[PDB]
Amino acid sequence: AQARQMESLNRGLVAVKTGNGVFVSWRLLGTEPSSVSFNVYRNGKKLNGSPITSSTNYQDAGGDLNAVYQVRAVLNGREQAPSESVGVLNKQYKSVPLQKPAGGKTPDGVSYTYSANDASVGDLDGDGQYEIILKWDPSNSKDNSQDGYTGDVLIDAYKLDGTMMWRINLGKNIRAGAHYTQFLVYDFDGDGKAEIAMKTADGTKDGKGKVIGNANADYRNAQGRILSGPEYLTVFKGDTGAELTTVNYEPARGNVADWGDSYGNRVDRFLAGVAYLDGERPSFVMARGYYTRTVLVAYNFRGGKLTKLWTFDSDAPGNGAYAGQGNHSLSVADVDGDGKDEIIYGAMAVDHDGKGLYSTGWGHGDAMHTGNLDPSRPGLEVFQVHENSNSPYGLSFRDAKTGKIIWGVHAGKDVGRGMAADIDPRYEGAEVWANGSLYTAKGVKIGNTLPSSTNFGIWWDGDLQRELLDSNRIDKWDYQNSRTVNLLTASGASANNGTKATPSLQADILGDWREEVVWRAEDSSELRIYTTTDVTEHRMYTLMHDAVYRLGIAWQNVGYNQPPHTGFYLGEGMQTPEKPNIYT
Ligand SMILES: [Ca+2]
Ligand SMILES: [Ca+2]
Ligand SMILES: [Ca+2]
Ligand SMILES: [Ca+2]
Ligand SMILES: [Ca+2]
Ligand SMILES: [Ca+2]
Ligand SMILES: [Ca+2]
Ligand SMILES: [Ca+2]
Numbered sequence: 001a002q003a004r005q006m007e008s009l010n011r012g013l014v015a016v017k018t019g020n021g022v023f024v025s026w027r028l029l030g031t032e033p034s035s036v037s038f039n040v041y042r043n044g045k046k047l048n049g050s051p052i053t054s055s056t057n058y059q060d061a062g063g064d065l066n067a068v069y070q071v072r073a074v075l076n077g078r079e080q081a082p083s084e085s086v087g088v089l090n091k092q093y094k095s096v097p098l099q100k101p102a103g104g105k106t107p108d109g110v111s112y113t114y115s116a117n118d119a120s121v122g123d124l125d126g127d128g129q130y131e132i133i134l135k136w137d138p139s140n141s142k143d144n145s146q147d148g149y150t151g152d153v154l155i156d157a158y159k160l161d162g163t164m165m166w167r168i169n170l171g172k173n174i175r176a177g178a179h180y181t182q183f184l185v186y187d188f189d190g191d192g193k194a195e196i197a198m199k200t201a202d203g204t205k206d207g208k209g210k211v212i213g214n215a216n217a218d219y220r221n222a223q224g225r226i227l228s229g230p231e232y233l234t235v236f237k238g239d240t241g242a243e244l245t246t247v248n249y250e251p252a253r254g255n256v257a258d259w260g261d262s263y264g265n266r267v268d269r270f271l272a273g274v275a276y277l278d279g280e281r282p283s284f285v286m287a288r289g290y291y292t293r294t295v296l297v298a299y300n301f302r303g304g305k306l307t308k309l310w311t312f313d314s315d316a317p318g319n320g321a322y323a324g325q326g327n328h329s330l331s332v333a334d335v336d337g338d339g340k341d342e343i344i345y346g347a348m349a350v351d352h353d354g355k356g357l358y359s360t361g362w363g364h365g366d367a368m369h370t371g372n373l374d375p376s377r378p379g380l381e382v383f384q385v386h387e388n389s390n391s392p393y394g395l396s397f398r399d400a401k402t403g404k405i406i407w408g409v410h411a412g413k414d415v416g417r418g419m420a421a422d423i424d425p426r427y428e429g430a431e432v433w434a435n436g437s438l439y440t441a442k443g444v445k446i447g448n449t450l451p452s453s454t455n456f457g458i459w460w461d462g463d464l465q466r467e468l469l470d471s472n473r474i475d476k477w478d479y480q481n482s483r484t485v486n487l488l489t490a491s492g493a494s495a496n497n498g499t500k501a502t503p504s505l506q507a508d509i510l511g512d513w514r515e516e517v518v519w520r521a522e523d524s525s526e527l528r529i530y531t532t533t534d535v536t537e538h539r540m541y542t543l544m545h546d547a548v549y550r551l552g553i554a555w556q557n558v559g560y561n562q563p564p565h566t567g568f569y570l571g572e573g574m575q576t577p578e579k580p581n582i583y584t
């Protein structure tokens with residue numbers, strides 16, 4: 001009973017030169033009725049796609065590199081104003097060149113360079129096409145448990161044509177590393193353009209060069225950590241990067257040792273997430289802590305003002321079960337039916353008003369997947385893994401609303417990876433895997449092997465199973481032979497963060513409902529946006545117009561990046577998915 005704000009997008013038309021013709025795909029928008037159809041136009045407004053639809057891709061045999069495409073929606077037998085016009089890509093990726101920052105030297109005395117790291121997307125200027133907001137990582141970035149000085153964290157915005165809109169420098173008082181800066185790109189106020197929200201400090205320099213706080217404060221200690229001095233929360237304006245408003249980060253660190261160590265590990269474990277706590281409009285949550293004291297703080301940014309909505313603190317009375325449950329990521333989804341978003345903080349959940357929903361007591365894990373994994377169960381499921389060898393489960397498949405287990409598997413050990421996806425059509429729903437085994441959504445062990453990666457799942461070819469993504473590979477589970485075969489190796493491109501091996505971004509940002517992959521070139525001279533050329537016979541509303549998925553894109557960069565999920569069941573046997581309840 002609720003419509004959600006959702007980004008006004010253009011048709012997302014993309015064309016790609018293939019052996020034999022040109023491949024084309026476009027969006028089906030969530031503002032459109034299911035009855036819509038399309039005609040495709042090659043060059044001189046030539047109708048080409050003679051009758052109409054059932055998908056939003058089309059293979060054009062008589063297409064060449066000099067061709068120009070437009071598509072026209074048909075609303076009730078009446079063709080509409082054409083889309084934007086596009087040329088043809090001579091390779092299966094779009095190059096976005098980067099203004100790569102020059103290296104530098106820390107007090108350390110050491111030298112360091114930058115590489116393109118985690119990304120997000122948003123419509124910063126309102127033209128109906130996504131920009132890429134990119135985090136730059138210095139080669140001396142640090143995990144929380146490693147001493148050492150780190151280079152400045154920088155965040156750029158780029159249009160798809162390579163236009164660099166601005167650079168923000170977080171400055172010397174924001175340590176570089178996976179668990180420090182978590183950045184949220186969303187249209188919070190509803191003005192139709194996106195803002196950026198993240199944690200700042202004395203000396204962060206906005207996109208117009210304006211310094212926040214004291215440009216001469218240096219709270220870096222001799223171990224390269226910032227364990228003193230004030231802490232800020234800032235939202236910047238999308239098209240310019242300018243400070244809009246800055247408030248005090250909550251909670252502040254206080255006595256560092258109260259978090260469970262004196263050397264600055266547990267205290268600087270951060271997460272963040274966009275959530276429609278309204279059921280209608282976006283909020284965001286900034287989180288601090290998970291091994292230990294765990295605090296979530298929710299906000300709105302509307303009418304130029306940042307307002308605190310609520311605070312959940314595990315130190316607070318009655319909330320002590322909720323400590324030690326958080327993962328190195330979070331999920332966001334209406335799990336209880338009320339139209340409003342709850343926060344699935346790893347092995348615990350917070351309700352939309354700031355109140356504990358449940359704590360499983362199974363403890364912190366390094367991966368999680370929240371979606372409709374078993375389409376035979378109404379409601380969502382959460383499949384995750386757990387670090388605690390003394391946990392009853394090393395992998396657990398539970399009810400997302402109550403937190404009660406559905407099935408789970410005792411390992412007496414850390415299980416540091418786990419995945420969820422429909423890779424086997426013999427079993428309706430998503431299969432899951434971790435710690436040497438592959439299971440049905442019901443908990444039954446399939447075969448004896450498992451896919452060659454346990455990282456990301458990506459919808460890439462034309463079928464309803466999901467494919468696999470790791471390093472610079474897209475792979476496919478051959479469920480008949482129990483082997484992983486390769487569909488694409490993006491040679492020259494590279495993933496990020498060594499063993500995590502994640503892409504800068506995975507997201508349906510162009511064309512068809514299939515997902516695009518944003519990998520950096522090895523030297524970080526360009527980002528590459530890969531889009532599929534597999535003709536599909538399936539049609540769906542753009543994944544960026546689904547609530548759970550869009551919010552998945554917004555937290556992908558967060559902590560140890562996890563892959564996105566749809567709020568509906570996407571896989572073999574799915575129903576023809578219905579128009580989403582949204583406005584633009
Ligand atoms: Ca834009
Ligand atoms: Ca806005
Ligand atoms: Ca809800
Ligand atoms: Ca609720
Ligand atoms: Ca961990
Ligand atoms: Ca379900
Ligand atoms: Ca399946
Ligand atoms: Ca597929």
Ligand SMILES: [Ca+2]
Pocket residue numbers: 507508509510511512513514515516
């Ligand atoms: Ca796509």
Ligand SMILES: [Ca+2]
Pocket residue numbers: 118178556557558559560561
């Ligand atoms: Ca990350």
